[PDB]
């Protein structure tokens, strides 16, 4: 009896798969208003790009995703064989068997995070200008973690502001976004705390990477109690990558050193669910300041 479950009736329809839901008009109107509010806080000079739900497998491999979350990655596979082989696969399906044995991987994966494709794009432009580069990116992301909880989806929307530059450019950016994101959450009337955290790396060695991540305070999350205060839900994250992507993609800052990067990430589906959990599914009953901030009138 999860405390979020009652929200399903107004927000979602089943699509025959845990963590994959059709969104109602009510739900989508709030995601879109949340998206517009975030946009209103975009800094001048920030370049906006919108990514599709798939990206280059080679790019994702190069970025090190497999060494971190091999279990969460969704790959695109297809029937790439001859017409005879494909017809046979379909005939096996017709006769109660499994057509998927004829599948082979494509050169694409489902994007696990909005920011991954932006680093090779930045890299292709040559040396960073002084002050670095800022991006506003968004994508439908995919993580292979089926669950019946409405705050843990397999397919979900992510919106990020990304900074690429010197270590100082990035820490200044993260500092300011941590303050602003909290102001936004406050304006939205949400109850939250911000604390250091770690990514769920894979395997035993992954545990140590996580330990180091927490010690270096590379990742903050804005956490909202949805089912409980004991296990709150991370609805935003503030990530410092150090030089990982800069070195991987050969991005040099204006001093000729490998660039650092960081991002502030907003979980759009989690924020929307947080809003409905907090204020209920009747929009006319939402606090006036919240309605105002979202331009609901």
């Amino acid at each position: 009896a999860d405390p979020l479950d009652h929200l399903a009736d107004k927000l979602f329809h089943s699509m025959g798969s845990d963590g994959v839901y059709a969104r109602t008009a009510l739900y989508e109107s709030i995601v879109e208003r949340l998206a517009a509010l975030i946009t209103s806080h975009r800094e001048a000079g920030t370049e906006a790009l919108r990514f599709p739900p798939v990206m280059s497998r080679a790019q994702l491999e190069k970025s090190g995703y497999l060494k971190s979350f091999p279990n969460l990655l969704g790959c695109v596979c297809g029937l790439h064989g001859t017409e005879r082989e494909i017809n046979a696969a379909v005939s096996r399906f017709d006769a109660g068997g499994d057509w998927t044995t004829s599948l082979s991987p494509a050169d694409l994966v489902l994007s696990p995070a909005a920011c991954y494709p932006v680093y090779p794009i930045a890299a292709s432009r040559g040396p960073l200008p002084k002050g670095g580069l800022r991006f506003d990116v968004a994508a439908d992301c995919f993580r292979r973690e089926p669950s019946k909880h409405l705050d843990r989806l397999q397919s979900f929307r992510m919106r990020e502001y990304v900074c690429i530059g010197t270590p100082d450019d990035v820490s200044d950016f993260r500092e300011r976004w941590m303050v602003r994101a909290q102001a936004i959450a406050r304006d939205l009337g949400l109850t939250f705390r911000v604390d250091y955290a770690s990514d769920p790396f894979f395997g035993r060695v992954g545990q140590m990477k996580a330990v180091s991540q927490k010690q270096q305070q590379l990742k903050f999350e804005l956490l909202i109690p949805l089912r409980s205060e004991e296990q709150p839900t991370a609805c935003m994250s503030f990530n410092y990558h150090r030089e990982h992507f800069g070195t991987t993609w050969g991005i040099q800052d204006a001093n000729g050193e490998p660039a650092h990067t960081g991002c502030v990430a907003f979980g759009m589906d989690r924020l929307a669910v947080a809003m409905f959990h907090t204020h209920g599914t009747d929009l006319s009953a939402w606090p006036a300041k919240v309605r105002d901030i979202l331009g609901l009138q």
């Binding site: 990477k209 180091s212 270096q216």
Partner: peptide, 12 residues
């Protein structure tokens, strides 16, 4: 250890 200057691959 983090103050010493050890990064993640160091800790690994």
């Amino acid at each position: 250890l983090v103050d010493v200057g050890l990064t993640s691959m160091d800790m690994v």
